[PDB]
Every structure is written in C-alpha cells, then in structure tokens.
C-alpha cells in the first residue's frame, strides 16, 4: 500500500497520515518506535466497528472511505513517545485463487521533535556525502544499482543526521522536499 | 500478554522453532498469525488462522497452537531468514490486536571475515570512514592525526548479505586538516587492526 504524511510532528501537535487502498475488509494502523516491537494502534472492520489500543484510545483517529480509496490516521497530543514507523495494513484475505492476503504500507518514519526541518548538503567523496540534515530519513539512488552500498545516517552532537553512500548520487531528503543530484 | 525468546539461532539446512506464550482470552480462544520482518522493511504475513499460510509464503514456514502456546517453524534454512519474528493474535479481553515482543533469529555457520575499510577526505572539514563487509558484527575504531590519538561513530549494524557495517566521522576545521602532514581511521575487528590513511 501507498502511505503518505508529515515525517515531522511537532510535540502536542497531530500527526496525520493516509493510506490508499483499493478494497480489503479490515483496516488498521501499527507502529514500530526505533528498535523496538511491534505496536497495534487501531483497526476498523468493514462493518465500521472500531478497536483502539486502550494506552492510546484517547488521542487517536481512523477513519476509512472505501469509495476515495483512502484510509487515515490521526494522532493528536503527540509526545517523543509517538516517534516511530507507523504502517497501515489492510486485511483482504482469501479474495480469488489467493489465500491470506493481507498488505502493509512501506512504513513512515514519524519523528516527533520541535526541531526544525534541514535538508542536507552534498559532498563529493567514490561516494556521496549526505550531511547536517533533519530528521531522517535520507534516500539515495545512482543515476546503476549494483555496487551501491548507503549506510545507517550517524546522529552527531549536533542533533543532525549525514550519512555515507558508496559505489551521479540523487539524495532524495523529503521532510525538507529536498533532492540533490 | 504475548511472549516471545528475544532469540533464536538456527544452522543453514537445518530447523529453529519460535515459540509465543499466551492466556486464554487470546492465544487460547482465538487464530494466531505470524509476521517476518526484515530489517528496514514492512512485517510480511508468513501464517494465519493459527497454520495457514498466505500465498507466496515458501512451505518452510508452518505453524501450530498448543492450548496457550503457538509456535513458528522453520526448515531449510538460509541466511536470508535472518529477521525479527512477531506473533499476533485478538485479546478478547482487551478488545485489542496484540502482538509479541519478537524473536531475532540468527543463523550461524557464516566465517569470520575482516573489513572493508573506506576512508574519504574532505572535498576541495570532514573525515569519512566507511567499515563494511564483517562478521562478527563489533569494530574498535581509532583515530590518528599525524601520529597522535570530534569523533562520531555508528554503531554496528547488519547489511542485508547478514554481515555488518558501521561509519566514523570526524569533524575538523580547514584549518585543522591542513595542519598535518596526514590523517588515518584505524580500525580493530577480532585483535586484527587495519589503517587507512589520507593526507592534505
Ligand atoms: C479470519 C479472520 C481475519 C482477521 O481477523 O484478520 C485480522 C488481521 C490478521 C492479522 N492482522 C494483524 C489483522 C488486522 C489487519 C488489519 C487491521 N487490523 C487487524
């Protein structure tokens, strides 16, 4: 599925994101803060009966809309307790020949900070420099995809992400609408 | 309410077993699921309804449910089935979608290996050391300016081929990189220490 929203939200702000969807009979949210488990947020059924996670069922919002193909999360109040990758999932099940379908989102990075936005600047390294940005994440793609190896972004004193990428680098950083080549 | 071993390991060719212990308002009356996850990448059914799997999902995976307790399993195994494993399941009690803590399945039998090591200079001030390729997955790294010991490094983490990669940085003033005839990434995996040097 296709997931879209802010990957920035700030503290006691909301934080919304879509997923489109062409069918299923349930759908849901769930999160991942960095390095941990797996968190249920909510599901609707196609009925409209509705679950939230009884630790969160205050703050959140979902809503499904079949025939505008979109189902939405919202989550207000966040805290730095909200930072994480939320997908939204949605449950087909044995539909044709096919049996279990159930299909995920690719997952949004969502980090919850008061922090500005800042793209990053571009070195020549051979390899791409991708430095001073906020938040994560940054992409990078090579014009060529064999030989390409990007590496895990470092946090420096600074409170700002670079990274490395080895093997033209397009340095895609979305939080900041930035694309280098 | 679902728990899971934080790890596994299994040998390639061979089977590991992944056990999910619950109570009676949801492992007890209701269908477990399983999901692989790779990392970086979205959960992937592997099982429903307690044993069934999803088209696409290889028959290496199966799955049982043995009262409160369900387990994953998993034969022929390769490298590639390296991941973070969650059980699923409703809790009646809790109206709510509840999920295991995970398991991290590792598999052995990969040799050790010595690193790849990168270092950049500073385009016409940043120091870029890339480590790549090894395994085990822990690197000492030091830093020299000519001979004499702003350094920020990566922890280790895995790459997709299940070896392991990190990055050090080294933050200095064009003024300060001038100023020395050399600068070098030393890096220490397995009491084997490689140098990498680039000079102003
Ligand atoms: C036969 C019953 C099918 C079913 O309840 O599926 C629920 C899916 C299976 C596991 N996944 C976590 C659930 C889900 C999917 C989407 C939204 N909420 C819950």
């Known amino acids: 599925l296709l997931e879209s929203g802010p990957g920035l939200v700030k503290p006691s702000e909301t934080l919304s994101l879509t997923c489109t969807v062409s069918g299923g009979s349930i759908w849901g949210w769930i999160r991942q803060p960095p390095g941990k488990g797996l968190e249920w947020i909510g599901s609707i059924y196609s009925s409209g009966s509705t679950y939230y996670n009884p630790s969160l069922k205050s703050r959140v919002t979902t809503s499904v809309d079949t025939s505008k193909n979109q189902f939405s999360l919202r989550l207000s109040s966040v805290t730095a307790a909200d930072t994480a990758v939320y997908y939204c999932?949605?449950?087909?099940?044995?539909?044709?020949?096919?049996?279990?379908?159930?299909?995920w989102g690719q997952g949004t990075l969502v980090t919850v900070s008061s922090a500005s936005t800042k793209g990053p600047s571009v070195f020549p390294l051979l390899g791409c420099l991708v430095k001073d940005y906020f938040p994560e994440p940054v992409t990078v793609s090579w014009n060529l995809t064999s030989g390409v190896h990007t590496f895990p972004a470092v946090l420096q004193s600074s409170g700002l992400y670079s990274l490395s990428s080895v093997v033209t680098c397009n340095v895609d950083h979305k939080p900041s609408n930035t694309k280098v080549d | 309410e679902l728990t899971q071993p934080p790890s596994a390991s299994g040998t390639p060719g061979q089977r590991v077993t992944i056990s999910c212990s619950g109570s009676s308002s949801n492992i007890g009356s209701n269908y477990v699921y399983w999901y692989q996850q790779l990392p970086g990448t979205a959960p992937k059914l592997l099982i429903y309804?307690?044993?069934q799997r999803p088209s696409g999902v290889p028959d290496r995976f199966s799955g049982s449910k043995s009262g409160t307790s369900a387990s994953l399993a998993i034969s022929g195994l390769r490298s590639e089935d390296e991941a973070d494993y969650y059980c699923?399941?409703?809790?009646?009690?809790?109206?709510?979608?509840?999920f295991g803590g995970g398991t991290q399945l590792d598999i052995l039998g990969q040799p050790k290996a010595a690193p790849s090591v990168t270092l950049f200079p500073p385009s016409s001030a940043t120091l870029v050391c890339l480590i790549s390729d090894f395994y085990p997955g822990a690197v000492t790294v030091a830093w020299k300016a000519d001979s004499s010991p702003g350094v920020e490094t990566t922890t280790p983490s895995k790459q997709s081929n299940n070896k392991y990669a990190a990055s050090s940085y080294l933050s200095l003033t064009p003024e300060q990189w001038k100023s020395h005839r050399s600068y070098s990434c030393q890096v220490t995996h397995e009491g084997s220490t490689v140098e990498k040097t680039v000079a102003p």
């Open positions: 309804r307690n044993n």
């Open positions: 999932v949605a449950w087909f099940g044995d539909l044709l020949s096919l049996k279990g379908v159930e299909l």
């Open positions: 699923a399941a409703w809790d009646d009690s809790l109206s709510a979608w509840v």
